[PDB]
Design a binder for this molecule. Structure first.
Ligand code: SF4
Ligand SMILES: [Zn+2]
Ligand SMILES: [Zn+2]
Ligand SMILES: [Zn+2]
Lengths: 677, 380
DNA sequence: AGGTAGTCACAGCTGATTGCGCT
DNA sequence: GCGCAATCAGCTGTGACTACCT
């Protein structure tokens, strides 16, 4: 309906508005009037997007000059499509409640693989070759030679769009990615090119994080779109982590082998300007020198270029001209396809980065590999350490950047992890007619022995027996599926092997089916499918996985799937690889971040992220248990999101297994009753 | 604003005086206001009914050993099932109850589908001391119930009640195909769980048109069973439903007469105990078979033996008694003696029937509308 | 010739100290 | 070495028992 905020009226598709949504709208309006950044935290995956879009539309209607462009960067494609359809529903509601259209355009952006119409490039599953084939089919030289009408296979969507799609605009009508593809195929135009031509004359547009955090494409996709713009990174509780992936690269034997294989072909094509032809030839030997050197670790981000200029005597300046070479020299060479050429581009980017960005980075070499530690595997990592570098460009170009997700419990660490000036410090806890979740921390077992997953007690028989007993007698009270998370794959497999050795895993087997998540994508998908089908009927199942796995965030356990989520010990990231410790030292000497505090923050963030996916929707309910006495400590409970703290009473913070089972039984029995709206 | 934040209610303002002593008369009206506190309907709900072939499925897994309900789930469940059977046969004259027990991934038909109340109670009492082993199998019990109820006539309402204690079931085949088959067969399935809500039970109840409930405590268990006691509503006229049933007269045998022939009861002959060799009992109108209990379907000729008063007890719902016209005593010009109780009419209001135009006091009107269900004047 | 501030028991609270835990 | 939880000191409420002046 029409919500009347202190200076505006906003239409909302749903007549009923929860108090949390109203408070969130008030806070967001306050932030927009404050013309500053901020961070938000909500406990509901759904209902946030509709409120955000409604308030954005209301603010644009009230202040067209203050806000011109809106960005809703998300994590993956399902989020993009669901927010697109939510925006479509909002626009339909506005049209049905008002009666006249408005000149608002909404489009979704993705990779060229997602948005393409050629049947000769869709079937392949090479994300690094679609762009190369697209560039080969249509480019500046293609347009130049189209004047003579050369008889060669090439894309023709642009050859029609440039003469027919650059004149007619799209003032109204929000289009989804499939809608854009349909429009392009019916008009004979490329969806990507029309999207590029239409972002300038557009109201809202959504895409993924990689189009803003990666500087190589953010500038091209957003340079002078809007000085005064609003961007939001929903579900970005691990944003800093992916920020590291923005400026982290790895080198292996395959990359250098591919480079040495393709440089011969490049030289053969050339002999059919010289400032880089001879420059590139001797670049590989300097980095292959470390291959023959058997050393543990070398750290010299500033002195690496010094070693480069001592071994080969090259100035630092021409490295800065490598990047501009990519758009200049390569287009003269007429590369048939970017395949067997990506390692050269990534090496050039790495050289440019180390020449330019070396103040808050670190070069690491690791002679270690999984199950083949020291045979042949020197891995070079230009690992990033400060998340501010990946976040400065968006903070200096936008006015009200908002970071929101389902788990942002410490609001004082993000503003100091990366350069930020929050003005919000706001948390929201969902409320319903009844308590939909019953978090509890189970400490010592029936033997009055702690079940903490300490490194010195990982192989202890007593804690393994207690975990097995908890999983057994818990599986008989909560039906249709339990999702259990372990610290790591090694610990998980050792624990299940120990359970198999004893006559305890068989007892769990007859209650629920046991499913194990592995690194294989197809195996994980089929295991998830069989778990879902087993939970559909009354058989019930247990899904055992790891907190730091692709299955932790790739799926959401909707109601009746995973009524119970079990955390076996505090999930702590491994301190090896000399990657975590470098970040700890950088945070200590730069941001004055305690190492123990950061480790606890990361562990509790992962635990909350993997435990908060059991509550999707108001009608949904679930159980959340932590099988570690360390969770009972205040410094770790304080790291849980506010919407879980108030439901975690002090009565059950160190209760044993039997009382936890009784609490679970009582909660499920009282939650099985019908409720109202 | 709020309702209680306005003006304070003064309930004592109702009483008034005009002659310094009239208050008594006012309280007399209060006494007249005291009566007629009912809606003149002992039930006030469903005015008809339909025959039911109900099957009760009882879990026999280890979960029945839980002590949530003292002493354990099985004992309280069987006690409440005996109560439910008694009440169900009390409120349904021509219905039938079958009992299936699920145990060790198998289903055993503990009692055949019949209308005898005593047999089911004895079977439950025998099953009180059963051994709980294995895990329940909803698929087998539902398959057996569907197989037995498939051939029942369409006019009968086919119902299956499942008391699911364990939270897990073993299905030898896909259960959703069985659910679709039940939906095509028009079978109502209702589940009353004990521990927590299960997805399969909810889906089954939703698709088959039944109701799924979860027990909070023993009182809630009894309330759910009582709710299941009530027959489902039936259409005004559905089909050609008629059933051939006899009415055995309870002829006892006395040695004074020469027609005293002792005979063993057919039902008692099937028991392990020595059959009762009584003087007489109920004789089948078709084959003159002797029975001791009613209503019991005849084993020989297949005829159903039903007691006429049980059927006739529900006839007042077919012909409800119309409310009498309330008339003040002053406005009625006639005799001032009640037609029913012969008492003098002194109340402010006199009720007159619309048919026989007889006068009944408040007590007689309430008695006729509540218990008698027939106007004494209209009888003549 | 007849009645209330100390005193005792058993609980509560808050204001510090004060030994215990460490991927 | 730091941080969280266990512990005690001091004050107070509640109810009842007891030793010197109108
Ligand atoms: S120009 Fe567009 S349609 Fe043609 S290959 Fe590239 S992405 Fe596909
Ligand atoms: Zn007979
Ligand atoms: Zn009378
Ligand atoms: Zn009458």
């Amino acid at each position: 309906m029409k919500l009347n905020v202190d200076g505006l009226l906003v239409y909302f598709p749903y007549d009923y508005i929860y108090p949390e949504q109203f408070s969130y709208m008030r806070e967001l309006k306050r932030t927009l009037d404050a013309k500053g950044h901020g961070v938000l935290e909500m406990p509901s995956g759904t209902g946030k997007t509709v409120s955000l879009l409604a308030l954005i539309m209301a603010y644009q209607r009230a202040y067209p000059l203050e806000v011109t462009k809106l960005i809703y960067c998300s994590r993956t494609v399902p989020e993009i499509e669901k927010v697109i359809e939510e925006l479509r529903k909002l626009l339909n509601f506005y049209e049905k409640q008002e009666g006249e259209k408005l000149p608002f355009l909404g489009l979704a952006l993705s990779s060229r693989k997602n948005l393409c119409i050629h049947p000769e490039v869709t079937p392949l599953r090479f994300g690094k070759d679609v762009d190369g084939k697209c560039h080969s089919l249509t480019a500046s030289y293609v347009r130049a030679q189209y004047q003579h009408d050369t008889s060669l296979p090439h894309c023709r969507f642009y050859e029609e769009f440039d003469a027919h799609g650059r004149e007619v605009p799209l003032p109204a009508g929000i289009y989804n990615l499939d809608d854009l593809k349909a429009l392009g195929r019916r008009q004979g135009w490329c969806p990507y090119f029309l999207a590029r031509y239409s972002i300038l004359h557009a109201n809202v547009v959504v895409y993924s994080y990689h189009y803003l955090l990666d500087p190589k494409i953010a500038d091209l996709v957003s340079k002078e779109l809007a000085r005064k713009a609003v961007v939001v990174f929903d579900e970005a509780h691990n944003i800093d982590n992916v920020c590291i992936d923005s400026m982290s690269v790895n080198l292996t034997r395959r990359t250098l082998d591919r480079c040495q294989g393709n440089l011969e072909t490049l030289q053969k094509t050339v002999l059919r300007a010289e400032h880089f032809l001879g420059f590139l030839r001797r670049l590989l030997e300097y980095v292959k020198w470390r291959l023959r050197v058997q050393h543990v670790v070398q750290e010299s981000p500033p002195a690496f270029l010094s070693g480069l200029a001592q071994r080969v005597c090259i100035q630092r300046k021409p490295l800065r001209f490598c990047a501009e070479r990519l758009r200049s020299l390569l287009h003269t060479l007429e590369i048939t396809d970017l395949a067997d050429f990506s390692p050269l581009t990534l090496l050039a980017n790495f050289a440019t980065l180390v020449s330019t960005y070396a103040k808050g980075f670190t070069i690491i070499i690791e002679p270690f590999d999984d199950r083949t530690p020291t045979i042949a595997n020197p891995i070079l990592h230009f690992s990033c350490m400060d998340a501010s570098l990946a976040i400065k460009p968006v903070f200096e170009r936008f006015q009200s950047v908002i970071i929101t997700s389902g788990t942002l419990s410490p609001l004082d660490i993000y503003p100091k992890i990366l350069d930020f000036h929050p003005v919000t410090m706001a948390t929201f806890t969902m409320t319903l007619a009844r308590v939909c979740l019953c978090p509890m921390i189970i400490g010592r077992g029936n033997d009055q022995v702690a079940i903490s997953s300490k490194f010195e007690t990982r192989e202890d028989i007593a804690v393994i027996r207690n975990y097995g007993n908890l999983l057994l007698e818990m599986s008989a009270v909560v039906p249709d599926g339990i999702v259990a998370f372990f610290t790591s794959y090694q610990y998980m497999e050792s624990t299940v092997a120990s359970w198999y050795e004893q006559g305890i895993l068989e007892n769990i087997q007859r209650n629920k089916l046991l499913f194990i998540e592995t690194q294989d994508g197809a195996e994980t998908s089929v295991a998830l499918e069989k778990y879902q089908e087993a939970c559909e009927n009354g058989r019930g199942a247990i899904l055992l996985s790891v907190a730091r796995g692709k299955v932790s965030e790739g799926i959401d356990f909707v109601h009746h799937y995973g009524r119970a989520v079990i955390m076996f010990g505090v999930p702590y990231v491994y301190t090896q690889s000399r990657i975590l410790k470098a970040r700890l030292e950088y945070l200590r000497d730069q941001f004055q971040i305690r190492e123990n505090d950061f480790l606890t923050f990361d562990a509790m963030r992962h635990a909350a992220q993997c435990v908060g996916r059991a509550i999707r929707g108001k009608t949904d309910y679930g159980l959340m248990v932590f099988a570690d006495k360390r969770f009972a400590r205040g410094d770790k409970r304080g790291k849980l999101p506010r919407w879980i703290q108030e439901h975690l009473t002090d009565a059950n913070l160190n209760l044993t297994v039997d009382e936890g089972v009784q609490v679970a039984k009582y909660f499920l029995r009282q939650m099985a009753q019908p409720f109202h709206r | 604003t709020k309702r209680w934040e306005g003006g304070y209610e003064r309930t004592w303002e109702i009483l008034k005086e005009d002659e310094s002593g009239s208050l008594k008369a006012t309280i007399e009206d209060i006494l007249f206001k005291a009566k007629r506190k009912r809606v003149f309907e002992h039930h006030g709900q469903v005015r008809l009914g339909m025959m039911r072939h109900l099957y009760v499925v009882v879990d026999g897994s280890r979960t029945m050993e839980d002590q949530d309900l003292k002493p354990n789930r099985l004992t309280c469940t069987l006690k409440l099932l005996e109560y439910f059977v008694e009440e169900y046969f009390d409120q349904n004259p021509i219905s039938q109850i079958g009992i299936i027990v699920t145990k060790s991934k198998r289903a055993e038909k503990l009692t055949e589908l019949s209308g005898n109340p005593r047999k089911h109670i004895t079977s439950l009492k025998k099953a009180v001391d059963m051994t709980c082993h294995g895990e329940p199998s909803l698929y087998n019990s539902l398959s057996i119930a569907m197989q037995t109820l498939k051939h029942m006539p369409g006019h009968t309402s086919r119902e299956v009640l499942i008391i699911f204690s364990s939270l897990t079931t073993c299905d030898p085949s896909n259960i959703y195909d069985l659910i679709k088959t039940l939906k095509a067969a028009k079978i109502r399935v209702s589940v009353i769980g004990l521990s927590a809500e299960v997805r399969v039970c909810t889906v089954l109840a939703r698709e088959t048109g039944g109701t799924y409930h979860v027990i909070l405590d023993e009182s809630h268990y009894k309330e759910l069973l009582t709710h299941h006691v009530s027959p489902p509503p039936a259409s005004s006229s559905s089909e050609c439903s008629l059933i051939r049933m006899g009415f055995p007269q309870h002829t006892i045998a006395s040695l004074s007469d020469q027609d005293a022939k002792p005979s063993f009861s057919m039902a008692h002959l099937d028991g392990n105990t020595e059959p009762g060799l009584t003087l007489g009992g109920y004789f089948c109108p078709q084959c003159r078979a002797k029975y001791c209990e009613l209503p019991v379907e005849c084993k020989i000729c297949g005829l159903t033996l039903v007691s006429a008063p049980h059927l006739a007890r529900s006839y007042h719902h077919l012909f409800p008694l119309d409310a009498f016209q309330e008339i003040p005593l002053e406005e009625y010009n006639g005799e001032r003696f009640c037609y029913g109780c012969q008492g003098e009419l002194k109340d402010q209001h006199v009720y007159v029937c619309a048919v026989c135009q007889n006068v009944f006091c408040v007590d007689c009107d309430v008695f006729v509308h509540d218990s008698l269900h027939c106007c004494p004047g209209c009888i003549h």
